[PDB]
């Protein structure tokens, strides 16, 4: 036995938590002593037949990340007689913003929403400093530890930008969240830190609408471009963005917050605000 990894036989399965790109997430108690004093952990495994190499890249990323607003890497579980691996993380009981916010409209106010925005921007600024682009920043990937704390909670599409380079070129865009993507990503498959800033703008929009499904980026953008274009969808998205159309101001979102959102949605990546600038922008609105 390796005591530095998690033993499969002791990751006692409790509950399904959610499904990712290359893995599913389940709640387990790691209880190697057998006395139920072990902690609950979240465990990301490969789905029944997307690949092991992909999950291994996510493990490599998450080992390399340590931030208050990034889901905490705990370890790995290696599988016998096979290339199998599992990713072990801390358990964040309230799940994603996407499920949490609709249940807590009356509890979470604008000020708390702005604090989440700051926490997300801090996670992301850290992420960028490590030279990663997230490529999947949406409220469904922001996990809630508690009313007062959120963490970026999945890294399945995350890529490293080479030192001295400004973007990573994606060769495999097969499940990109196109309604969260900046024009350069849609048009050229180039992903800059400024591309994550764009996606944050969209994540912010979700937050302010409490992740109401009827006001989701997809639901709103499909209203602008028509729903039945299939393979022409991204073309129509690009057309609309070139025209300078953006998601509208959530109702009850103040203009000064909306103006920060808009700074994330400049067409040219270089014209967009930084995450550090967002952090300071939001903090100036917090008393
Ligand atoms: C679907 C996705 C891969 C983003 C994911 N969903 C969850 C999740 C959902 C509900 C919940 F109570 C906890 C989690 C959770 C968690 O607690 N830790 C790490 C990831 C993760 C997660 N990761």
Brief characterization of the structure:
This protein is an alpha+beta fold. It is 33% helix and 18% strand. It has 2 domains: 1-91, Phosphorylase Kinase, domain 1 (2-Layer Sandwich); 92-287, Transferase(Phosphotransferase), domain 1, CATH 1.10.510.
Question: What does this molecule look like?
Answer:
The chain folds into two domains: 91 residues, Phosphorylase Kinase, domain 1 (2-Layer Sandwich); 196 residues, Orthogonal Bundle (Transferase(Phosphotransferase), domain 1), CATH 1.10.510. The protein has a five-stranded antiparallel β-sheet, covered by helices on one side. Helix 5 packs antiparallel against helix 8. The protein is built from nine helices and eleven strands. It is of the alpha+beta class and 287 residues long. A hairpin with a 6-residue loop joins strand 4 and strand 5. The site of ligand IZA has 18 residues, from strand 1 and strand 5. It is found in: Endomembrane system. This is Tyrosine-protein kinase JAK1. Belongs to the protein kinase superfamily. Tyr protein kinase family. JAK subfamily. Interacts with IL31RA. Interacts with IFNGR1. Interacts with JAKMIP1. Interacts with SHB. Interacts (via N-terminus) with IL2RB and IL10RA (via its cytoplasmic domain). Interacts with FER.
């Amino acid at each position: 036995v390796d005591p530095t990894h998690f033993e499969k036989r002791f990751l006692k399965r409790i509950r399904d938590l959610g499904e990712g790109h290359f893995g599913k997430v389940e709640l387990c108690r790691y209880d190697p002593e057998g006395d139920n004093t072990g902690e609950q952990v979240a465990v990301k495994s490969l789905k029944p037949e997307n690949h092991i190499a992909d999950l291994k890249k996510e493990i490599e990323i998450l080992r390399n990340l340590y931030h208050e607003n990034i889901v905490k890497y705990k370890g790995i579980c290696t599988e016998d007689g096979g290339n199998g691996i599992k990713l072990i993380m801390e358990f964040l009981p309230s799940g994603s913003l996407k499920e949490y916010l609709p249940k807590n409209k009356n509890k979470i106010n604008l000020k708390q929403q702005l604090k989440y925005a700051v926490q997300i921007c801090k996670g992301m600024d850290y992420l960028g400093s490590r030279q990663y682009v997230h490529r999947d920043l949406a409220a469904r990937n922001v996990l809630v530890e508690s009313e007062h704390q959120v963490k970026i909670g999945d890294f399945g599409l995350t890529k490293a930008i080479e030192t001295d380079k400004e973007y990573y070129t994606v060769k495999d865009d097969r499940d990109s969240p196109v309604f969260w993507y900046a024009p350069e990503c849609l048009m050229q498959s180039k992903f800059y830190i400024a591309s994550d800033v764009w996606s944050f703008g969209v994540t912010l929009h979700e937050l302010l609408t409490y992740c109401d499904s009827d006001s989701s980026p997809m639901a709103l953008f499909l209203k602008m471009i028509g729903p039945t274009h299939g393979q022409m969808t991204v073309t129509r998205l690009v057309n609309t963005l070139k025209e300078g159309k953006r998601l509208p101001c959530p109702p009850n979102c103040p203009d000064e917050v909306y103006q920060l959102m808009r700074k994330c949605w400049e067409f040219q990546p270089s014209n967009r605000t930084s995450f550090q600038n967002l952090i300071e922008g939001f903090e100036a609105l917090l008393k």
